[PDB]
């Protein structure tokens, strides 16, 4: 019918967007930050070495209480660790041993996990029976789950490999909203502190900002040469840093709609697995496939320090809600807490 | 330590949980894990039935050995970004239908998939068990259509024992790491009740090789 006209309109929309983005690019973040003093050498020690897992560690999450953390391994069991005493709180035997993500609810009543099974497993930690049981199974996805996060309103935003992100209502077990637009497989989500907006990363080398209510992608970011692996929000929620298999992390600002600064090093060719921010946001921590975790100055990218307390891939990384300590998990079945 | 607060029952529960975790890990390690591939292009369902909405797990015990198989038929996602999660499987069962040579042909797609998984770095040391299912159908079909339709470079007789041997040799030739990786090719049919024996022999050989590495002889 008018496919040629549609494609021409799309191309000139892309041109207009590029022109608008370039018009406001008066200067880069590097020039503005030239006068800021360096963060210096950031050195941390492995205060704790949590052990008990007998398989690869893939995901972990920090509870709002700053003490309890949950880790998911391929043994099919979730262990909640008391970081202050390297003590195990509960052991949750999972129906499926192929997990890929886990999350800790801010309220602390529920813990969620999932993976290749395509089913969300919601476990109730606080119950009168003591034993941990599955509350609801949020079935409906047509692909492997990659990341799940708990909204402050006791809701789960699910990321799956079928290119769809869904907002599930726990008590009804139904998809409240369906999100589409990513041509590639979705890997990581991150919700802002206010829970108003959140961004999703996919294998199409693009990051899309989805408003949980309007059902629309407010903004889209692109430029990466390979798949996206992890995304995290700046404490403000006005910017986010995304990792990619191309061994480069970059910072994007929602109010700028353009790349701010790129993190890369000649000696680093391994890809990134997880990315997290410090409470102040000055330090950017991201795990790499080179069996080590690197600390980057979010403002200048000086590579302030590096962590090498691991023997295999660093699969999961998470900063405490208060920024007191950083947890680094790896496929070696050991979790290291840094501070 | 002994200087902790009165809540030492928490440490006792932690030790009990550690004991349970160790027992579960020992049980998991004792069991054999196998990966099944070829869904959507081969008679995988027939092999699964002989052994008898995402990954499917099948449990069966043979000759006092516990077998645990995973079906990844949900191939509607980027394989390279989740295949690595299976690093550690004892062996990989790859299913091919010999009747797909004439039906780019589907046999070429199966060959490309095998090359993709055979050469994957995550499966460098994991042996592959190859089953050529629907052998009778291919035997009947070869008498009507020459094998040259799928392999123009092929030259030889149209007899079953020749074409089957040629294709069996062709599949192995794609292995670029023959030194550290072995391929166990077998012919499978719906009426072949001894297919379990082939898998048992393959897993026994894999366990023998692992024991040889552990003892230093490999």
């Amino acid at each position: 019918s008018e496919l040629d006209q549609l494609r021409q309109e799309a191309e000139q929309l892309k041109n207009q967007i590029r022109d608008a983005r370039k018009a406001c690019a008066d200067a880069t973040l590097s020039q503005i930050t030239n006068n800021i003093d360096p963060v210096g050498r950031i050195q941390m020690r492995t205060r704790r070495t949590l052990r008990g897992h007998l398989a690869k560690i893939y995901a972990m999450h920090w509870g709002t209480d700053s003490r309890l953390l949950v880790s998911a391994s391929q043994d099919g069991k979730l262990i909640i660790w008391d970081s202050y005493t390297t003590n195990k709180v509960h052991a949750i035997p999972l129906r499926s041993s192929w997990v890929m993500t886990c999350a800790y609810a801010p309220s602390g009543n529920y813990v969620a996990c999932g993976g290749l099974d395509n089913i969300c497993s919601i476990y109730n930690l606080k119950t009168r029976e003591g034993n941990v049981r599955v509350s609801r199974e949020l079935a409906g996805h047509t692909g492997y789950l990659s990341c799940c996060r708990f909204l402050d309103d006791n809701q789960i935003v699910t990321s799956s490999g079928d290119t769809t992100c869904a907002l599930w209502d726990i008590e009804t077990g139904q998809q409240t909203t369906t999100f589409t637009g990513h041509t590639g497989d979705v890997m990581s989500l991150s919700l802002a502190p206010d829970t108003r907006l959140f961004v999703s990363g996919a294998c199409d080398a693009s990051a899309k900002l989805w408003d949980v209510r309007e059902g629309m992608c407010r903004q889209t970011f692109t430029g990466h040469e390979s798949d996206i692996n992890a995304i995290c929000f700046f404490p403000n929620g006005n910017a986010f840093a995304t990792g990619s298999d191309d061994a480069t992390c970059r910072l994007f600002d929602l109010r700028a709609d353009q790349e701010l600064m790129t993190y890369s090093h000649d000696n680093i060719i391994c890809g990134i697995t997880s990315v997290s921010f410090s409470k102040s946001g000055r330090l950017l921590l991201a795990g790499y496939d080179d069996f080590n975790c690197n600390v980057w100055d979010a403002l200048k990218a000086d590579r302030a320090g590096v962590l090498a307390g691991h023997d295999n891939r660093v699969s999961c990384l998470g900063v405490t809600d208060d920024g007191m300590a950083v947890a680094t998990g790896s496929w070696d079945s050991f979790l290291k807490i840094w501070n | 330590c002994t200087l902790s607060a009165e809540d030492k029952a928490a440490v006792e529960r932690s030790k009990m949980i550690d004991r349970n975790l160790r027992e579960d890990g020992e049980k998991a390690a004792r069991e054999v894990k196998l990966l099944l591939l070829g869904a959507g292009e081969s008679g995988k369902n027939t092999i699964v039935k002989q052994m008898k909405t995402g990954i499917v797990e099948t449990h069966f015990t043979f000759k006092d050995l516990h077998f645990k198989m995973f079906d990844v038929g949900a191939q509607r996602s980027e394989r390279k970004k989740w295949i690595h999660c299976f690093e550690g499987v004892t062996a990989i069962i790859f299913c091919v239908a010999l009747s797909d040579y004439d039906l780019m042909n589907r046999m070429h797609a199966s060959m490309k998939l095998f090359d993709s998984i055979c050469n994957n770095k995550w499966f460098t040391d994991t042996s592959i068990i190859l089953f050529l299912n629907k052998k009778d159908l291919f035997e009947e079909k070869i008498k009507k259509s020459p094998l040259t339709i799928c392999y123009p470079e092929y030259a030889g007789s149209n007899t079953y024992e020749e074409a089957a041997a040629y294709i069996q040799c062709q599949f192995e030739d794609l292995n670029k790491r023959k030194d550290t990786k072995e391929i166990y090719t077998h012919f499978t049919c719906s009426t072949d009740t001894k297919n379990v024996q082939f898998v048992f022999d393959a897993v026994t050989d894999v366990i023998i090789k692992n024991n040889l590495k552990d003892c230093g002889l490999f």
């Epitope: 003590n87 034993n131 | 607060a5 009165e6 029952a9 928490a10 006792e12």
Partner: single-chain antibody
């Protein structure tokens, strides 16, 4: 969750008895158990404790050796081997669950108990305090040692024993509201002086308030204060 005890009745002094308790819909394997006496003088006391898997067992100096606490996880039952009975042993026996981990609320359920008839110091300033519906009441108790452990927990437990009913937990380890109770209950303390307050009294808040420490064994129980309408 339900706990039922059995094995009561009259017993001659110096005899033997094997009290038993059974639970249903109860993860007995992962749950600990406590035995506490309730003498006719309304003074609660601690008898024995058995941890999960029978790993650790403790007895009070008043019941040492004579009592042998045993559990059978497959049967989900708890047993007491009682020998050398005396007159002072005449008291109601309660089975109390307990779980120990971060954020835990031990002693959250008390059994109906059974009656057996034989042929750190806690003090309460007020033996009783008259009250009326809708009135605000404040109760305080004192301890012989500072319960503020270095871990940052006051280890203060509060219970209510309504007439004819088993005690019910109110607070756990710091002013923390128990599950299933209204929000009108609150508490505070400094380490040696502890207080419990109720914003608005209701008809269901009539009974005896009990205070017990958990800093070190044996678990010593308070005398208790009775609330009169």
């Amino acid at each position: 969750v339900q706990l039922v005890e059995s094995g009561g009745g009259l017993v001659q002094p110096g005899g033997s008895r094997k009290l038993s308790c059974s639970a249903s819909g109860f993860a007995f394997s992962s749950f600990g158990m406590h035995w506490v006496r309730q003498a006719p003088e309304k003074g609660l006391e601690w008898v024995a404790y058995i941890s999960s898997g029978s790993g650790t067992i403790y007895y009070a100096d008043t019941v040492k050796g004579r009592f042998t606490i045993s559990r059978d996880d497959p049967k989900n039952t708890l047993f007491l081997q009682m020998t050398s009975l005396r007159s002072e042993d005449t008291a109601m026996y309660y089975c109390v669950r307990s779980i120990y981990y971060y954020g835990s609320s031990p002693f959250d359920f008390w059994g109906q108990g059974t009656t057996l008839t034989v042929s750190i110091v806690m003090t309460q300033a007020t033996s009783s305090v008259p009250v009326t519906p809708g009135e605000s009441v404040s109760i305080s108790c004192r301890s012989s040692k500072s319960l503020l452990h270095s871990n940052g927990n006051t280890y203060l437990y509060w219970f209510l024993q309504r007439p004819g009913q088993s005690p019910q937990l109110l607070i756990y380890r710091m002013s923390n509201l128990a599950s299933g109770v209204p929000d009108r209950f609150s508490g505070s303390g400094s380490g040696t002086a502890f207080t419990l307050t109720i914003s608005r009294l209701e008809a269901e808040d009539v009974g005896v308030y009990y205070c017990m420490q958990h800093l070190e064994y044996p678990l010593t129980f308070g005398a208790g204060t009775k609330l009169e309408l």
